[PDB]
C-alpha cells in the first residue's frame, strides 16, 4: 500500500492520480521542493527544441522508450530517485503529459502551501495564501485604484448586464 498525501494541488486522476503518488513519495523524505526546482529547470531543458524530438522524441522508432532519459537526464543527476518515475513516463509514453504533472506539481509546488482565488471583476487575484479576504483586501491595498472594474470588468456585466437581465 502507500499513504495519501495532497499539499494544495491536487488534481485526482489522469496525472493527478500520479502527482499524488510523488506528492506522498517526495513529501515523505521531503525532497519535494528540491525536486520541484529540480522538475521546474527540467520543465524547459526538456520542452526544447534542440530536441523537438531528441529529449521528447517518442518514436520515429522505439529506442527512446528503451531509454532516452532513463539515459539523457539520468545523464543529468537532476531527478536521482524521481528520475525513476520519469523513466516510467519515458517508457509508458506519457512523456508529453509531464507539463500538467509539473503544473500540477508547481501550482502544486508554490501554491503547494497556498491559496489562489479570483472573485468577480478582478482577474490577477491569483496568489498563494493561508487566509482570505483579508489578503484580497490587501490587494485592494495595492491601491484600491486599479481593481474590481478592470482587468475583468464590472462594466457590461456584473452591474451592467444585471439591469438588462430584469428586462
Amino acid at each position: 500500500f502507500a499513504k495519501l498525501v495532497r499539499p494544495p494541488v491536487q488534481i485526482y486522476g489522469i496525472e493527478g492520480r500520479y502527482a499524488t503518488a510523488l506528492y506522498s513519495a517526495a513529501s515523505k523524505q521531503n525532497k519535494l521542493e528540491q525536486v520541484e526546482k529540480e522538475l521546474l529547470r527540467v520543465g524547459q531543458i526538456l520542452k526544447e527544441p534542440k530536441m523537438a524530438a531528441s529529449l521528447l522524441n517518442p518514436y520515429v522508432k522505439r529506442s527512446v522508450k528503451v531509454k532516452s532519459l532513463s539515459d539523457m537526464t539520468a545523464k543529468e543527476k537532476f531527478s536521482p530517485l524521481t528520475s525513476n518515475l520519469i523513466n516510467l513516463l519515458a517508457e509508458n509514453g506519457r512523456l508529453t503529459n509531464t507539463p500538467a504533472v509539473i503544473s500540477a506539481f508547481s501550482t502544486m509546488m508554490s501554491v503547494h502551501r497556498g491559496e489562489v482565488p479570483c472573485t468577480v471583476t478582478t482577474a490577477s487575484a491569483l496568489d498563494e495564501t493561508t487566509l482570505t479576504e483579508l489578503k484580497t483586501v490587501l490587494k485592494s491595498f495595492l491601491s484600491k485604484g486599479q481593481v474590481l472594474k478592470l482587468e475583468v470588468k464590472i462594466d457590461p456585466s456584473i452591474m451592467g448586464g444585471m439591469i438588462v437581465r430584469i428586462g
Binding site: 471583476t121 479576504e133 484580497t136 483586501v137 485592494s140 474590481l148 462594466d155
Partner: protein, 58 residues
C-alpha cells in the same frame, strides 16, 4: 361586433407602450450607459462593496 373595436384601440396602445418600452429600454440603456464609466468611483463603489465583502464576508 362593436367591442372588438374599442378593444383594438386599447390593445394597440398597450402593445405600443411595450414597443416604446422595448425601444426605450434598448435606446435609453444604449444612450445613458456608454458615458457612465468616467466614474473611477464605480470602482470606488466596487472598492466600497468589496470592503463590504472583505469586511462583510465574515
Amino acid at each position: 361586433e362593436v367591442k372588438n373595436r374599442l378593444d383594438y384601440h386599447i390593445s394597440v396602445q398597450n402593445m405600443m407602450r411595450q414597443k416604446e418600452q422595448e425601444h426605450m429600454i434598448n435606446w435609453v440603456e444604449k444612450r445613458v450607459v456608454q458615458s457612465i464609466s468616467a466614474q473611477q468611483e464605480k470602482e470606488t463603489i466596487a472598492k466600497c462593496i468589496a470592503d463590504l465583502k472583505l469586511l462583510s464576508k465574515k
